[PDB]
Each structure stands twice: as structure tokens, then as C-alpha cells.
């Protein structure tokens, strides 16, 4: 079986720049060596195969090398939209395989969280569960702090958060951070605050709401 | 060809079967080779297998031989896979993927994906709540809008604002698995305040697997 | 190459009966001609070497002649202990060779099966598979059929059977036959039967159980 | 009294070689000539070649020259022969077997056998699964019982009960392949129903080549 090797597992650079992914085959593939660009839950596409031929459509900026045992994906200029995992692939062998994938992210200058808070709907509270909500929108770099205090007291283990894609246009992250409290629990407390700490922001931010 | 269109999305108990179609929508599967590769959770694109109809020929990765049969009907010109005795480890989307029938060629066409969750689990079907901002929150010009989408089972729910007209400033967050082994997610847009003057803000939300189609407009408190 | 012919490939014998083997070499291989009994997933046994002498241990109902080409093995009182494969083999040219062996099957009274059916076990229901077993045993001749039937519909290519070897005691077979179904279409039927038809019974034999206890 | 004792089953690629053990305990190979001799599935003893150490002397059958080499260590008292270039015919139970050095002699001990399995397949271990009646089924005075041995590759798979104290009724079929390109196998007993009340029934499996080993009550 042939073991396909991408090196680096992630990659962040500018608008412009230009990146190089490698791919090592275990053993000689000779030209059989093919490229994909994938989107989260998106379909795969074919940038180059055969080493060095670029797929119709795709931008000049991308360009395939290599031969036997060692590859390179270049992109020249890197642009928002090419925020993507990376593929290699060989169609050598009898069984096919897939390198593990490089992630390519973008580098752009700070921008601080917009950051707004949502008490639990009073359709939620009747059936015995507070979820209170804090987002934080178009902010870079993804590195963020999100802490809940109910009348000051920090919680623990009761809040989950999620992440958006890293924007195609952008470059920006989106965040949301859920507390979970039974009714119980949520009628007992009047301050609801969420705390943000990121590198854009001099102080932390807090937005709150009382019960 | 064109486009390969795949099956919605499946769940499935663990020990049983899924059969997912890929449709050559606006062409054909004569003289190529129809692959099918899965990519678990957080994990890359693994192969799975290949058929080239033309050679009457049939290839699996060692760890998908005898689990993995993939068959090509050209009456209704579709590629079926059939994963059987499922197991929590099968949960993943599965990708067909075309190449030419010659040695070496790569995968030029991909379907979409078909997400496949294996679980006993029961499915369940959100409770959809408004994401309603403050008056002194939308005071500043900027109005957070949203709808929070608890405690469902299984993946996927989908979320559209105003019936597919809002997309822009549209950031629906992946769904988290929470202690309860259910999944809640939230949808939010962010719009200018005095547009909630001018328009409705509603959240369509559809969790096809317990035929739930709820929409709920949003306005701040 | 010395060449090694036996005859006949089977038999069939009762209880009691005289039972005589025959082995020929292409050479005369003087009296260097050994005999091996072999029971299924045992080793070879030898029981008479140089022809005629027995291994110790081996009882004398087994005796062995001949020379040069033709050689007999001989039971003079078969047993139920000695259904096996008989192999004769020479040892005397450096290429040593052995005869396509001789397998001794008993012929005895016809005896219907014992059916026993075996719901899946909860443990491998957990991990979503339901193998439902049924056991036919104890029984004679071998030819035996199971059908399973599913709220009576009659099942196809879902079920393997594997048979025992002839019992050394009593002469006997015994059949397992699995059904395999995902735990989600076990969940959806009430009655699994299974129908076995054998030589013993004039009509065949249900057996069955009602998932959930009915 | 001399035992040979072989080494385990084992899969192995196509294409690959095999190496197997003969360890004489309670004797030597020393003043001894040793066979291997193979036995392919359903089919008759086939014999391999043969070295005499104490005479410094081999011999391979025609079918085997270049394909299979037979050695000895006496230092260890082990036996080995190798078979290279592996196809899914070389698949079956190898045995060793001793005779004397003298000319003509019979082969008197023989090992336990090794199966070979000549598969690209993985090694797995078994799920043990119990075999138990409907509580009426016991209600008849005869209870059945058994354990199913399910999805492992290559073969084989060991089955005692209550340790080897239960022996009589037991019955251990042949393996069956699945479609999945895995064994499983059943085990079963008759016993008393009421002994069911008096004592418990465990199935012990081994499945060496995947180092699984399960011990398994069964109850209704």
C-alpha cells in the first residue's frame, strides 16, 4: 500500500503570499499524484492531477510539482477564498489513498469582537431550561475568552461554544457561546454577564442583562 | 456528469444498512470509474472502493471488503453504495466521485456528500426559541437576530432566513452534542436596527428525520 | 515416485461389520508400508507399520497384510471410535508418498433430531445484530434441511448451516443453523421458526419462539 | 513420553513466506529424521521434504523443491520449516512428524498441526455471544446451551466449557465464512434443565492469533 505524508498539518499567511504544501508518497508514484481543495461540508474539487496539470477553471495561482516520491502544491497569491483543507492523492496503485490534509487559513489585522447577549425566550423558561446565549461577530484572530457570571459567581462546566468558518471574504470568525441553567436554578439569580477577552480589545468587554 | 446529485441525508441503527444513490444528473457513468470515499468527523477522505461498470470490475480498501458493495443501475443511471452492519465509527459523509475509466486518472466530479449518523439513539425534533436582542442592545444600530434550535436528534437541522432571502451577515454555528446526547445549535444575522421597521426577520428551521418545519419570527424584547 | 492407490475413496459399514481397506503402490516397496488413522482437526495416528505390526496401544480388531504392491488394512469388528480417515503411506524410497486416504463412515439405525431454537442473546442485540441459532442434534443419516420463517415468510440467503463430524459414540450428526438479521428487522417480527425436514420424521418439525415472549 | 508442540496459526500475506516451529518436549531430534507434511482443507496428507541431522542429510518432495526449507536447532530441540512465495493454495494445517533415522522406519510422534492462512484480511478477535433457550424451552428437562463465537479471521478459534470438567454433549461445529470474509462458530451443550438451578456454565474461547480470550456464563 502506498502511504501518502502531507507536511505542514496547517498553514496561516497573508493576502498575497505565497505557500507551498509538500506530499511524500511511501514509494515511487511516478506522475500519478493529484490535488484537491475542500470547503467544510463542502464536495472536494480537483485542482491539479498528474503532478503539475491544472483543472480548467482553476486559478493560475495554483501550480503542482514533484515527481516519485516528492510533491508541492504552490499558491502564489494567496486570496480570502482559498481558506480550504488541502488533499493530495495518488492514483498509482491498485487501492487508492489520500494524503491526511493541510489546512490553509489567512492572516489579516486584528478586529475585536462585536459582542451582544440573549436572555433564555420565555417560551424556553416555561419547560424548566435557561439557555443564555453571547456572540461574538467578525473578529480576528480566532484565539477568544469567553467567561459567564451569574451575580458575579463564575461558572463551570455548564457553558459549550461553537465557531464559524474562518469568512471567505473576510477573513473573520464568528462565536457563540451557550450557558445551560435549569428554570430553577436561572430564578434564583438577577446578573447575567458574559466577559470577552481577545487581542483586539484593550479592557475586557462584558455585556450583561439583569433577570 | 454534469452533476453527480447524492441521497439526503440517513440514520441508521447500528447493525443495519444504508444504500446512498448518486444521480449523474445531466449525464452518464459509460466508461468511467465511480468511487466512493467517506470523511469521518474532524477526519480526512478516506477511499472506500471502486467500480468501472464497462470492465465488470470491483475494488475495496482491505477494511471495507466484505461491509461495502457498490452497484451501478444504468435504467435510472445512478451508483448505489451499500454500507452494511453499521457501527458508530460509519457516522461520516460519503462522497461519489468520478474519474475517467483509464489507469491513473483523478476524481474530476464529486457529489455533495450524505451525512449518515449510526446511533440507537431516538430521533427527536428541535424546539426552535428566539434569539431576541435588548431595545438597549439594538439602541446602538445594529440589531442581533436569531433562533436557537434545542435539543434534537439526529444531525442535520436546516436553517434558512426569510424563506432563502437573507444569506448575507447569516452565521448559522455547527451543532454541539450536549451532555443529554442531543444537539442544540444557533442561527443568527445581524441587521441594521431600522430595518426591523421595513421587514420580517424569520428563522425557517427543518429537521426532515422527525418531519419537523417550524418558522419563527424574531423581534427584540 | 512410488505412486499410493486406495481403495475404495469412502464406505459406509455397520457396527460389528468386517471392514477391509486396500492400498497399491506403482513399485514393490517390499513390506515398508505404514497405516495412519486421522480424525478431523486431529493429527495422524499410526497404527500398523512394516505391513503387519501393530502400534502399541492399537486394539486388535486392526490388522494389516501384504507385500511388494498390494496391501490390505483390516477391521475385523468395526467400532464407533473408529470412524476416521485411514491413510496407508511407503517408507521405502527417499521421496516418501501417502495414499489419498480411505474415510470410514458408520451406517446405523435412523434417528430424528432434538430441535432446539436460541433467541439472540440482549449482549449481542446491545451491538445490533440478532443471530438466531437452531440446533438440531444428536440425529441419522446426515441429510437434514432447516427453513427459517419469519411471521411465516420464508427466508433466502440470510442463514449458514455447519455440520459435526460423525459422533465417535453413538454414530450420530448434529446441525447448527444461524438466521442473521440487523437488530432493526428482528424488532419488526413476532414469530421466528425454524422448519426441519429429516429422513426420521414423516412430516417436518417447527419450532419457535415469539420475540418479546408472546 | 515426547510431545511436539508447534507454534500458532497464522495469516500471511501472498507473496510473503511463513515460518514454523516443532519444539520436542520430553525428547530431542537427535537421533531422528523430520517430516512436514501438509494437509490442505477437505483434502489428503501431502508429504513436504524431511532432514536427518544426525546425518547431515534433506530431502524435498518435486512439488516443493526451492519453495520450502526444513532446519533443526538442537540446542533448543525446535524443528522449523519456511514456505515462501505464498498463494492462497499453500493455505492449510502443516504438521510435523518424527520417525527414526533408521531406513523404512514409520513417523510415530506427530505435532498438533499449524493452520496457515494465505489472505490479505486482518487479524480480529471474536464477540462471544451466549446461546440460552426461552425460559420454557428448559421447562421440557433437557436444556441446550451453547456460545457463538462470531466474527474473527483467520482461523482457529478454541472452545472449552467449565474449563474441560464438561466434555460429554458437547459439540463444536466447523467454522463457517461469512459474506463479511470472517469465521464464526457455534458451541453447544446438553445438559439437565435443572442443573441449571445447581451450578453455573461458562464457555472459554481462545482465539490465539488475535491474543482474544473470553470466558462467558451462559443463562437463559
Known amino acids: 500500500d502506498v502511504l501518502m505524508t502531507q507536511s505542514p498539518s496547517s498553514l496561516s499567511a497573508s493576502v498575497g503570499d505565497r505557500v507551498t504544501i509538500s506530499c511524500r508518497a511511501s514509494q515511487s508514484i511516478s506522475s500519478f499524484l493529484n490535488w484537491y481543495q475542500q470547503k467544510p461540508g463542502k464536495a472536494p474539487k480537483l485542482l491539479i492531477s498528474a503532478a503539475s496539470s491544472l483543472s480548467s477553471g482553476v486559478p493560475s495561482r495554483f501550480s503542482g510539482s514533484g515527481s516519485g516520491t516528492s510533491f508541492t502544491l504552490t499558491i502564489s497569491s494567496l486570496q480570502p477564498e482559498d481558506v480550504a483543507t488541502y488533499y493530495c492523492?495518488?492514483?498509482?496503485?491498485?487501492?487508492?489513498?489520500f494524503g491526511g490534509g493541510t489546512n490553509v487559513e489567512i492572516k489579516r489585522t486584528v478586529a475585536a469582537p462585536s459582542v451582544f447577549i440573549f436572555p433564555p425566550s420565555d417560551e424556553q423558561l416555561k419547560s424548566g431550561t435557561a439557555s443564555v446565549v453571547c456572540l461574538l461577530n467578525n473578529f480576528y484572530p480566532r484565539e477568544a475568552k469567553v467567561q459567564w457570571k451569574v451575580d458575579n459567581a463564575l461558572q463551570s462546566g455548564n457553558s459549550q461554544e461553537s465557531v464559524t468558518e474562518q469568512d471567505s471574504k473576510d477573513s473573520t470568525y464568528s462565536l457563540s457561546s451557550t450557558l445551560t441553567l435549569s428554570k430553577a436554578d436561572y430564578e434564583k439569580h438577577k446578573v447575567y454577564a458574559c466577559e470577552v477577552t481577545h487581542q483586539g480589545l484593550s479592557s475586557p468587554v462584558t455585556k450583561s442583562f439583569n433577570r | 456528469q454534469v452533476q453527480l446529485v447524492q441521497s439526503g441525508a440517513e440514520v441508521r441503527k447500528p447493525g443495519s444498512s444504508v444504500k446512498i444513490s448518486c444521480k449523474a444528473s445531466g449525464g452518464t457513468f459509460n466508461n468511467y470509474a465511480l468511487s466512493w470515499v467517506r470523511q469521518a468527523p474532524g477526519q480526512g477522505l478516506d477511499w472506500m472502493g471502486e467500480?468501472?461498470?464497462?470492465?465488470?470490475?470491483?475494488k475495496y480498501a482491505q477494511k471495507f471488503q466484505g461491509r461495502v458493495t457498490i452497484t451501478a443501475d444504468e435504467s435510472t443511471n445512478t451508483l448505489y453504495m451499500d454500507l452494511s452492519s453499521l457501527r458508530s465509527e460509519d457516522s461520516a459523509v460519503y462522497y461519489c466521485?468520478?474519474?475517467?475509466?483509464?489507469?491513473?486518472?483523478?476524481?474530476?466530479?464529486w457529489g455533495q456528500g450524505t451525512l449518515v449518523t449510526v446511533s440507537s439513539a431516538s430521533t427527536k425534533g428541535p424546539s426552535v426559541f428566539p434569539l431576541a436582542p435588548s431595545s438597549k442592545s439594538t439602541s446602538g444600530g445594529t440589531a442581533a437576530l436569531g433562533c436557537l434550535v434545542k435539543d434534537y436528534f439526529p444531525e442535520p437541522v436546516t436553517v434558512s432566513w426569510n424563506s432563502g432571502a437573507l444569506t448575507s451577515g447569516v452565521h448559522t454555528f455547527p451543532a454541539v452534542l450536549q451532555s443529554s446526547g442531543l444537539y442544540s445549535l444557533s442561527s443568527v444575522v445581524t441587521v441594521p436596527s431600522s430595518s426591523l421597521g421595513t421587514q420580517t426577520y424569520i428563522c425557517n428551521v427543518n429537521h426532515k428525520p422527525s418531519n419537523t418545519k417550524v418558522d419563527k419570527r424574531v423581534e427584540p424584547k | 515416485d512410488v505412486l499410493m492407490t486406495q481403495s475404495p475413496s469412502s464406505l459406509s459399514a455397520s457396527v460389528g461389520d468386517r471392514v477391509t481397506i486396500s492400498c497399491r503402490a506403482s513399485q514393490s516397496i517390499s513390506s515398508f508400508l505404514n497405516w495412519y488413522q486421522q480424525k478431523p482437526g486431529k493429527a495422524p495416528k499410526l497404527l500398523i507399520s512394516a505391513a503387519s505390526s501393530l502400534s502399541s496401544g492399537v486394539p486388535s480388531r486392526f490388522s494389516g497384510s501384504g507385500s511388494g504392491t498390494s496391501f490390505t488394512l483390516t477391521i475385523s469388528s468395526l467400532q464407533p471410535e473408529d470412524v476416521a480417515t485411514?491413510?496407508?503411506?511407503?517408507?521405502?524410497?527417499?521421496?516418501?508418498?501417502?495414499?489419498?486416504g480411505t474415510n470410514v463412515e458408520i451406517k446405523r439405525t435412523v434417528a430424528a433430531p432434538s430441535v432446539f431454537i436460541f433467541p439472540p442473546s440482549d449482549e449481542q442485540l446491545k451491538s445490533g445484530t440478532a443471530s438466531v441459532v437452531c440446533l438440531l442434534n444428536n440425529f441419522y443419516p446426515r441429510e437434514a434441511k432447516v427453513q427459517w420463517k419469519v411471521d411465516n415468510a420464508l427466508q433466502s440467503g440470510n442463514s449458514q448451516e455447519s455440520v459435526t463430524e460423525q459422533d465417535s459414540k453413538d454414530s450420530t450428526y448434529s446441525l447448527s443453523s444461524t438466521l442473521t438479521l440487523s437488530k432493526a428487522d428482528y424488532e419488526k417480527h413476532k414469530v421466528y421458526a425454524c422448519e426441519v425436514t429429516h429422513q426420521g420424521l414423516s412430516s417436518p418439525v417447527t419450532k419457535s419462539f415469539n420475540r418479546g415472549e408472546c | 513420553q515426547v510431545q511436539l508442540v508447534q507454534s500458532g496459526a497464522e495469516v500471511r500475506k501472498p507473496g510473503s513466506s511463513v515460518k514454523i516451529s516443532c519444539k520436542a518436549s520430553g525428547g530431542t531430534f537427535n537421533n531422528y529424521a523430520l517430516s512436514w507434511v501438509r494437509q490442505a482443507p477437505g483434502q489428503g496428507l501431502d508429504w513436504?521434504?524431511?532432514?536427518?541431522?544426525?546425518?547431515?542429510?534433506?530431502?524435498?518432495?518435486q512439488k516443493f523443491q526451492g519453495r520450502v526449507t526444513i532446519t533443526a536447532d538442537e540446542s533448543t530441540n525446535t524443528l522449523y520449516m519456511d514456505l515462501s512465495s505464498l498463494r492462497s493454495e499453500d493455505s492449510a494445517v502443516?504438521?510435523?512428524?518424527?520417525?527414526?533415522?533408521?531406513?523404512?522406519?514409520?513417523?510415530?510422534?506427530?505435532?498438533?498441526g499449524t493452520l496457515v492462512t494465505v489472505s490479505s484480511a486482518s487479524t480480529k478477535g471474536p464477540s462471544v455471544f451466549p446461546l440460552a433457550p426461552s425460559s420454557k424451552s428448559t421447562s421440557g428437562g433437557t436444556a441446550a446451551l451453547g456460545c457463538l463465537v462470531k466474527d474473527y479471521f483467520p482461523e482457529p478459534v478454541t472452545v472449552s466449557w467449565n474449563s474441560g470438567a464438561l466434555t460429554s454433549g458437547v459439540h463444536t461445529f466447523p467454522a463457517v465464512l461469512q459474506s463479511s470474509g470472517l469465521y464464526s462458530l457455534s458451541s453447544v451443550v446438553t445438559v439437565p434443565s435443572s442443573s441449571l438451578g445447581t451450578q453455573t456454565y461458562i464457555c472459554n474461547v481462545n482465539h490465539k492469533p488475535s491474543n482474544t480470550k473470553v470466558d462467558k456464563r451462559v443463562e437463559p
Open positions: 492523492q495518488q492514483s498509482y496503485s491498485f487501492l487508492l489513498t
Open positions: 466521485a468520478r474519474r475517467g475509466y483509464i489507469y491513473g486518472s483523478p476524481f474530476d466530479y
Open positions: 467500480i468501472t461498470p464497462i470492465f465488470g470490475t470491483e
